[PDB]
Amino acid sequence: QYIVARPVYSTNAFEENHKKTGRHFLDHLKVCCSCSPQKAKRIVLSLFPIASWLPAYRLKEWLLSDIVSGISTGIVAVLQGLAFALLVDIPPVYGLYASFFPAIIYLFFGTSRHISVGPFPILSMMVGLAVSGAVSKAVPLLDDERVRVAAAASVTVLSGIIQLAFGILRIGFVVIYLSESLISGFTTAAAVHVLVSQLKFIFQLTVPSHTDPVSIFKVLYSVFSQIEKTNIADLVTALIVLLVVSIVKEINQRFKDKLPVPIPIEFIMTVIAAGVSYGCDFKNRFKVAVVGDMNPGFQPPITPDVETFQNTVGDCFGIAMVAFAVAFSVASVYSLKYDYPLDGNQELIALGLGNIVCGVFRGFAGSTALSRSAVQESTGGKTQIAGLIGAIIVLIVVLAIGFLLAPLQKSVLAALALGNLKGMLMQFAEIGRLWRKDKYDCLIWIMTFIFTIVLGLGLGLAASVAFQLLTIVFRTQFPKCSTLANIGRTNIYKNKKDYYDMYEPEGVKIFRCPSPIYFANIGFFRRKLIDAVGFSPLRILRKRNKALRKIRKLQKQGLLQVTGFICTVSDEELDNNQIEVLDQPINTTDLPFHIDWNDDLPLNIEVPKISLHSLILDFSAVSFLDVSSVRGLKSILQEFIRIKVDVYIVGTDDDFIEKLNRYEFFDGEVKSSIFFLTIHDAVLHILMKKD
Amino acid sequence: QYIVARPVYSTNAFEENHKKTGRHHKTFLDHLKVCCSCSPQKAKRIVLSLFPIASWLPAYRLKEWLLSDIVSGISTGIVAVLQGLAFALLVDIPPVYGLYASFFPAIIYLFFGTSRHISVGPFPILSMMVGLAVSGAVSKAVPLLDDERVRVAAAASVTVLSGIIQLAFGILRIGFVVIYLSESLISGFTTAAAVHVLVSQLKFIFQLTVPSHTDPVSIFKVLYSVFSQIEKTNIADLVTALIVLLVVSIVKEINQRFKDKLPVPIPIEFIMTVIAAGVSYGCDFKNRFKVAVVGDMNPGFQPPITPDVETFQNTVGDCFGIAMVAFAVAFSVASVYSLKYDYPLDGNQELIALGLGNIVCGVFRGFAGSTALSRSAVQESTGGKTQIAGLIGAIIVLIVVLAIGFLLAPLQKSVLAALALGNLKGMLMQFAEIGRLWRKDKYDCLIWIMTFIFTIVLGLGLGLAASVAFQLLTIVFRTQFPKCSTLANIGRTNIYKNKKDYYDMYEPEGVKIFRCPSPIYFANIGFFRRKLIDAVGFSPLRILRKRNKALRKIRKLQKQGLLQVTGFICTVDEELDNNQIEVLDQPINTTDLPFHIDWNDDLPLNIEVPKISLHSLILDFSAVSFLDVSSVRGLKSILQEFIRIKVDVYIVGTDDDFIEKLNRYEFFDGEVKSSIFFLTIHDAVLHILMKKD
Ligand SMILES: CC(C)CCC[C@@H](C)[C@H]1CC[C@H]2[C@@H]3CC=C4C[C@@H](OC(=O)CCC(=O)O)CC[C@]4(C)[C@H]3CC[C@]12C
Ligand SMILES: CC(C)CCC[C@@H](C)[C@H]1CC[C@H]2[C@@H]3CC=C4C[C@@H](OC(=O)CCC(=O)O)CC[C@]4(C)[C@H]3CC[C@]12C
Ligand SMILES: CC(C)CCC[C@@H](C)[C@H]1CC[C@H]2[C@@H]3CC=C4C[C@@H](OC(=O)CCC(=O)O)CC[C@]4(C)[C@H]3CC[C@]12C
Ligand SMILES: CC(C)CCC[C@@H](C)[C@H]1CC[C@H]2[C@@H]3CC=C4C[C@@H](OC(=O)CCC(=O)O)CC[C@]4(C)[C@H]3CC[C@]12C
Numbered sequence A: 001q002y003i004v005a006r007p008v009y010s011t012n013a014f015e016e017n018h019k020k021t022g023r024h025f026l027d028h029l030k031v032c033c034s035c036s037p038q039k040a041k042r043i044v045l046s047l048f049p050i051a052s053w054l055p056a057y058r059l060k061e062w063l064l065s066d067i068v069s070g071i072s073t074g075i076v077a078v079l080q081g082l083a084f085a086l087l088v089d090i091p092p093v094y095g096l097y098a099s100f101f102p103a104i105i106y107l108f109f110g111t112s113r114h115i116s117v118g119p120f121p122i123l124s125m126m127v128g129l130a131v132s133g134a135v136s137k138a139v140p141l142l143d144d145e146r147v148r149v150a151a152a153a154s155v156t157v158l159s160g161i162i163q164l165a166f167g168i169l170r171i172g173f174v175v176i177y178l179s180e181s182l183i184s185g186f187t188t189a190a191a192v193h194v195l196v197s198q199l200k201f202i203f204q205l206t207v208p209s210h211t212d213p214v215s216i217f218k219v220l221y222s223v224f225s226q227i228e229k230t231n232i233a234d235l236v237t238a239l240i241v242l243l244v245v246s247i248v249k250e251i252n253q254r255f256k257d258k259l260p261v262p263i264p265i266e267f268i269m270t271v272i273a274a275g276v277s278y279g280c281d282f283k284n285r286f287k288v289a290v291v292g293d294m295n296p297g298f299q300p301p302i303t304p305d306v307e308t309f310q311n312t313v314g315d316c317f318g319i320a321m322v323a324f325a326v327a328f329s330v331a332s333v334y335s336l337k338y339d340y341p342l343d344g345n346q347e348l349i350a351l352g353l354g355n356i357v358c359g360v361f362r363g364f365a366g367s368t369a370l371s372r373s374a375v376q377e378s379t380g381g382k383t384q385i386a387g388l389i390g391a392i393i394v395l396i397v398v399l400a401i402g403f404l405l406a407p408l409q410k411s412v413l414a415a416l417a418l419g420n421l422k423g424m425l426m427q428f429a430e431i432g433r434l435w436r437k438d439k440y441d442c443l444i445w446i447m448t449f450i451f452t453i454v455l456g457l458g459l460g461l462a463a464s465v466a467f468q469l470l471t472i473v474f475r476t477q478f479p480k481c482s483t484l485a486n487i488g489r490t491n492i493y494k495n496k497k498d499y500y501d502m503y504e505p506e507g508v509k510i511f512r513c514p515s516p517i518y519f520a521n522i523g524f525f526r527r528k529l530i531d532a533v534g535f536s537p538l539r540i541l542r543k544r545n546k547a548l549r550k551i552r553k554l555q556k557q558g559l560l561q562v563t564g565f566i567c568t569v570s571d572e573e574l575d576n577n578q579i580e581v582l583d584q585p586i587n588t589t590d591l592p593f594h595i596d597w598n599d600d601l602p603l604n605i606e607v608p609k610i611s612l613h614s615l616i617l618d619f620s621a622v623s624f625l626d627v628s629s630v631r632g633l634k635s636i637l638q639e640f641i642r643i644k645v646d647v648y649i650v651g652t653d654d655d656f657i658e659k660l661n662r663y664e665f666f667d668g669e670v671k672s673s674i675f676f677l678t679i680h681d682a683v684l685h686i687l688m689k690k691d
Numbered sequence B: 001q002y003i004v005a006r007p008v009y010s011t012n013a014f015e016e017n018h019k020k021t022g023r024h025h026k027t028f029l030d031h032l033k034v035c036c037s038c039s040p041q042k043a044k045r046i047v048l049s050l051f052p053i054a055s056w057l058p059a060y061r062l063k064e065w066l067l068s069d070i071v072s073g074i075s076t077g078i079v080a081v082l083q084g085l086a087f088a089l090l091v092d093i094p095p096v097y098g099l100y101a102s103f104f105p106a107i108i109y110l111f112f113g114t115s116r117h118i119s120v121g122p123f124p125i126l127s128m129m130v131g132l133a134v135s136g137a138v139s140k141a142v143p144l145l146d147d148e149r150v151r152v153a154a155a156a157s158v159t160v161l162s163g164i165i166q167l168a169f170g171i172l173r174i175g176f177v178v179i180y181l182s183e184s185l186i187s188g189f190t191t192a193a194a195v196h197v198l199v200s201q202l203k204f205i206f207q208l209t210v211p212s213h214t215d216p217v218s219i220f221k222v223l224y225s226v227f228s229q230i231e232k233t234n235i236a237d238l239v240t241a242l243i244v245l246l247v248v249s250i251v252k253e254i255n256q257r258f259k260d261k262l263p264v265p266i267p268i269e270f271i272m273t274v275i276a277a278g279v280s281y282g283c284d285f286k287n288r289f290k291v292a293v294v295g296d297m298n299p300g301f302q303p304p305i306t307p308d309v310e311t312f313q314n315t316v317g318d319c320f321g322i323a324m325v326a327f328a329v330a331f332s333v334a335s336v337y338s339l340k341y342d343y344p345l346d347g348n349q350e351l352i353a354l355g356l357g358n359i360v361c362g363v364f365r366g367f368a369g370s371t372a373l374s375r376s377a378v379q380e381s382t383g384g385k386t387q388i389a390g391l392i393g394a395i396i397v398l399i400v401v402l403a404i405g406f407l408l409a410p411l412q413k414s415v416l417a418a419l420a421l422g423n424l425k426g427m428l429m430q431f432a433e434i435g436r437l438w439r440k441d442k443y444d445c446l447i448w449i450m451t452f453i454f455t456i457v458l459g460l461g462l463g464l465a466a467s468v469a470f471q472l473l474t475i476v477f478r479t480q481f482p483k484c485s486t487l488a489n490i491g492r493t494n495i496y497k498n499k500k501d502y503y504d505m506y507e508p509e510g511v512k513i514f515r516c517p518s519p520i521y522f523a524n525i526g527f528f529r530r531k532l533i534d535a536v537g538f539s540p541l542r543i544l545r546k547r548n549k550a551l552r553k554i555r556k557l558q559k560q561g562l563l564q565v566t567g568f569i570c571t572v573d574e575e576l577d578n579n580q581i582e583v584l585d586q587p588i589n590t591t592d593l594p595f596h597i598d599w600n601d602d603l604p605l606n607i608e609v610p611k612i613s614l615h616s617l618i619l620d621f622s623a624v625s626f627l628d629v630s631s632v633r634g635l636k637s638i639l640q641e642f643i644r645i646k647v648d649v650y651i652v653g654t655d656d657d658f659i660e661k662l663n664r665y666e667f668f669d670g671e672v673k674s675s676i677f678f679l680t681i682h683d684a685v686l687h688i689l690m691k692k693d
């Protein structure tokens, strides 16, 4: 049974009954600049994770699986680079570049062993919007893709520079702020953006490159205004590949019995399309938009153009943050599995270096794609050597084998990108779940979706995270303040309007604020305390001071005798600039009596009656205070003590006491003897003091 | 003494021992029929609230209020006429329209306002916001006397849009916007606006010409445009500005200190404006010297103009900032005078009144404004008992506009700027707050510093928006890394404190209490998991995976026929590939084995499992105020694997509403049962002890 026989403490008889322990900028500087040989070796190994895991290789049990997974992820990466390379309005030659240099750099500089870094559609569309904005903001057939590619390379370089700076500054906790509901809404909006943007390729039309605000609907108009100019054969083949891909995806997620190495319809039907393209000559018999001739070889590096460095400096921050968040989220699952310690700052540094290399070598920025990582992990990728195999596959397909991939319809790629989107868009079935879950996460999801579909894929994210930060204030703007009273005549206190056996001590009003008290709700806390208490202490003090002034005036006139309050037998309204004297503390030392303003009072003088001798502010749920809240609480406690009703604060810990000490909050009036351990011992001390 | 003899409760034997109450109605779908319930008394109350004039006009004590109100009205009227055509220079418009901004808002607020101690008009912060907005409008508009006309038209339109926004906000009853403006941010923004005033009045204190600049870095651009042409200043105008500045400051401080035997505050402002006008008319500053005298005042008002739609679209961003700053300044100024004299000011009514006043002023060729701090202070100090003083100020402005314009025409237009700089002493004194805040919170000081920097660089509207965003981020900053600790008993009673704080620290065997002194939401669930794992001492998922691997190897050996079950009689490394490792996270079931192996005492040969020392843990959630979907999911996963590794989990310090909220989260199921919540830490520990033995 629950039996306690301890004395009553007041947070100031406690420290004097139990001794404390030691509580000890130059402190951190010395321990941060302490150079050591072992520390240098550790930091070098961390900055170069390759040396950490290359020696610890179990070849005879890892090599075959890694090779198979590497070939699979390489074929998927070559299929995906020149598909995501179309969301950016650049030739698909450079898409393969974006899937090789980041992989090679991440081999050396990365920690995760189950991600295949490359381009993914969300970042590809971010880069496309950024490059369109750059080309539109730049002061003055084959004359457009050149500047598009140059601007894309520069924007990728700047995104990589931002990522590298963030990694160097060791601010890797940025991925914390994005959360889960916001990432789900942003993911759904980006999926819708993919669906809208791929229409211009699924229909084989020409669309002007729109930028930033209302990007989807502008593209929607530019696509739907020219339906009569589509190509029927291209639409038919894209449709047929779409339905067959969906059907086999269903038949693959189902029938998962005796089906090793699930059938890769992506590559299979891209091969089928390339074959029928070389066979029946869609370019001659029909009019299609086949991928252009692939030049054999890389391209010389180009210096990052400075003119577009300044123009896009806004969108590159969003690109870098989205890339880092996607990479961290994708690698989080594969680090939770297989139990290895992924490092966020190291991941940021690796991704930044990869983006610098890719942008310098005429590619575009990217990070590990969800589907590519999934296929790499499922195929048996034991480490990043699978990423190396994918990189060398991309290298050989760039250098030698390009003519077989040249006759690709360039719209089957768009439909394939639209293909793996069912699980990408299934998150739409979450508004209903979140409506009955929190009623705030659903709001944040809806606002995120609206902002990312109206403001665009860019500034929409910033507005979404700003609204996310505002949502915390929304949650704590109006705390459900209540009144507490005893239950069962023991040390249990609950809400007054919740139980039938409620018992309240005489003249004691317990107030609890179940939310942190900061700047945005100190006024609401004061109003709720006012309502729960039932009167305004400032009003009571003002009326008492007015009555005392009238009494003193009568005594000076010579109508009241002090021994009492015997009377032998003019409302003086006060002007401005002098009413402030009514807020002064009540002192009656000049009067020999001890009038309490409770029993009675001399003639024709009225003072509101009082029924409170104490109140207890429960601060168990209060987690922090700021300057505004401290000032408001000090004023509240000040006139509460001034109207001669004691105040007590309970449920606070030693660090909270220490923080409140350095606030100029304690003085001769608001003493430090007001803090108590629990509610019950405060009530007990209250009863002992009263009688 | 503290004596308690209650039974041990578990938040589920408590509800079954004490009956609850009704709680029979919701607050979302049934909230109607009380808001749309039309009633006669409700209609009278709402009409009285929407027209506060009828509330306090009948309740007038003339014989004790009229003389004081008249005196305060004359004083505030002379100050308002002195201030309108002074703040009218911050906007690049003729100072004739400045008097308009101090008359129509006052007249409208007379009818529509709740506060009885504010004199609504133009104030420098909003005047500069309107100036920046109108400069942006004139710069973004597609195509001597030809410039101020479009400037005035665009200023009137931007004022109209600000008033429309304020009226819409008041109608929507969102008057709680003002509480997103923490005192630290408001102080930083006030100081930055003071610096902006000081810089922007230089072009008039020096009598130069400066191109109108807009938004990003608008102080340093004006600083360059001013400092590039020092040689073009007028020495006489500079000399009179400096002498007036020093004397006004000196006598203002004399008024501050020598208040004893000082009947009525010193009229220095008006007295010296009169002196300057007199000497200007006398020595002919325009002829003998070259000055920038206020131009001739045309007698009469101006016909109303339609609000230009072309500039409606361009400035729609800056007008939100203008409206919010105006409403915040009005509410903050009236807050002091409502705390005094104890009357119930209504924020929505104030918003509606200010919006209507701004609409009228903008339609009648004025510019937006709200009650100025100094004007309100002088109106209150002079004895303003109600808004009839505001009416007297308004009629004073009317008569000075209509009749006496030639008297005020020969004003140097630089003494006005110096007077504007003179009062800036108290406004700029707030710079002595970074030091106070650095030793107070170390976060409010950061808010102040970032607010000042953002308002200096980004401008006024964009600076305020970015400052508010950073202020909102500061909450996450405060709760990003909670100071999580470990709790243990003190004195063998129901007192639990931090483990690293006392010498008599007693911890129960095999019980680890964890407390998170901050709300657990999306931005610290990972940190909470890391801290909990570190305090516990092991990874529960790692322990589960190793136990499952050992059990799989044991089952393989038993199938091969090497281990006998009856007790674990024995005789004499299969790495798992991907897409199948997920079987290691399954719950441990040994029903197929007759024994009850616990993975503590020992284990068959050549099989290693990490030892364990925890049989329960108590998560203190007294300080946890709220959870979201992400935190609920993370907590559910954590409790899931903790229960799966066969160590009980208990949560204490939570209230009935928190239990109710957590119930509708899909958080309780056959594994994470509802019997895990306890009242306090001590009864949880006691139940732990009773269950163990
Ligand atoms: C959910 C809400 C509160 C978020 C904020 C929404 C605004 C930022 C959006 C909604 C309407 C949008 C506008 C709708 C229409 C257009 C027209 C568009 O003009 C053109 O493309 C050319 C038109 C022409 O040449 O006639 C430029 C963007 C703009 C102003 C949009 C800019 C972004 C706006 C203001
Ligand atoms: C706020 C959310 C919930 C609703 C979003 C609706 C609007 C913000 C969208 C829907 C249709 C959009 C419009 C569709 C077509 C046009 C025309 C389009 O092209 C031109 O004006 C170019 C000239 C020409 O086409 O001849 C420019 C964008 C605009 C105004 C779009 C602006 C934004 C609009 C109004
Ligand atoms: C806190 C995070 C968001 C980073 C810090 C703020 C950046 C967003 C700022 C700080 C430095 C700024 C740069 C400082 C100097 C310049 C040169 C400046 O040169 C011009 O071209 C001037 C003419 C013009 O662009 O109007 C253009 C803006 C730019 C690139 C600025 C772009 C915005 C930057 C990167
Ligand atoms: C806030 C911290 C954690 C990250 C810091 C990274 C960025 C804020 C830096 C890194 C690279 C910088 C850019 C590098 C190069 C330039 C080009 C520079 O333009 C010129 O030199 C123009 C010369 C001319 O016009 O003659 C303007 C600044 C800018 C955009 C810089 C702006 C600031 C950037 C984006």
Ligand SMILES: CC(C)CCC[C@@H](C)[C@H]1CC[C@H]2[C@@H]3CC=C4C[C@@H](OC(=O)CCC(=O)O)CC[C@]4(C)[C@H]3CC[C@]12C
Binding pocket: B216, B217, B453, B454, B457, B458
């Ligand atoms: C505390 C920090 C993180 C806040 C963010 C700072 C930026 C938003 C500021 C800092 C530097 C500023 C820039 C400094 C210089 C200029 C040049 C200025 O160009 C001109 O006025 C014309 C110059 C010419 O004609 O040569 C335009 C604004 C701009 C780009 C400024 C835009 C706003 C910037 C990027």
Ligand SMILES: CC(C)CCC[C@@H](C)[C@H]1CC[C@H]2[C@@H]3CC=C4C[C@@H](OC(=O)CCC(=O)O)CC[C@]4(C)[C@H]3CC[C@]12C
Binding pocket: B217, B220, B221, B224, B457
């Ligand atoms: C971030 C904080 C802590 C420091 C703020 C410093 C800069 C943001 C300021 C200081 C000086 C400013 C510059 C001072 C002078 C100029 C020239 C000025 O005029 C022109 O370029 C017009 C052409 C001409 O004057 O001939 C435009 C603004 C600019 C670039 C200013 C841009 C903003 C600057 C770099």
Ligand SMILES: CC(C)CCC[C@@H](C)[C@H]1CC[C@H]2[C@@H]3CC=C4C[C@@H](OC(=O)CCC(=O)O)CC[C@]4(C)[C@H]3CC[C@]12C
Binding pocket: B164, B165, B168, B169, B172, B309, B312, B313, B316
């Ligand atoms: C969010 C809630 C609480 C407040 C709503 C207030 C504003 C968002 C509204 C009120 C007045 C509106 C403005 C009223 C008039 C116009 C002019 C209008 O322009 C035209 O009609 C152009 C016609 C043409 O070009 O032929 C464009 C919208 C705009 C700026 C409106 C934009 C939306 C405003 C600012």
Ligand SMILES: CC(C)CCC[C@@H](C)[C@H]1CC[C@H]2[C@@H]3CC=C4C[C@@H](OC(=O)CCC(=O)O)CC[C@]4(C)[C@H]3CC[C@]12C
Binding pocket: B312, B313, B316, B320
């Ligand atoms: C939540 C708060 C901040 C108010 C709601 C968002 C507003 C900031 C949005 C919603 C409606 C928007 C307006 C809707 C329609 C138009 C017409 C549009 O017409 C054009 O001139 C198109 C060409 C162009 O400006 O690029 C200009 C923007 C404007 C005024 C928008 C300005 C921004 C507004 C007021």
Ligand SMILES: NC(=O)n1c(O)c(C(=O)c2cccs2)c2cc(Cl)ccc21
Binding pocket: A076, A079, A080, A083, A120, A121, A266, A267, A369, A370, A371, A372, A375, A412, A413, A414, A416, A417, A418, A419, A420, A421
């Ligand atoms: N697994 C696999 O091989 N693939 C995919 O998942 C594709 C997608 O649709 C993606 C959407 C978001 C990331 S990938 C895809 C597209 C092409 Cl062109 C070729 C192969 C592809």
Ligand SMILES: NC(=O)n1c(O)c(C(=O)c2cccs2)c2cc(Cl)ccc21
Binding pocket: B079, B082, B083, B086, B123, B124, B269, B270, B372, B373, B374, B375, B378, B415, B416, B417, B419, B420, B421, B422, B423, B424
């Ligand atoms: N009290 C008073 O009479 N005055 C002031 O405080 C003036 C200011 O400088 C203000 C700065 C911010 C609000 S007012 C002022 C200016 C003039 Cl032109 C005439 C009188 C004035």
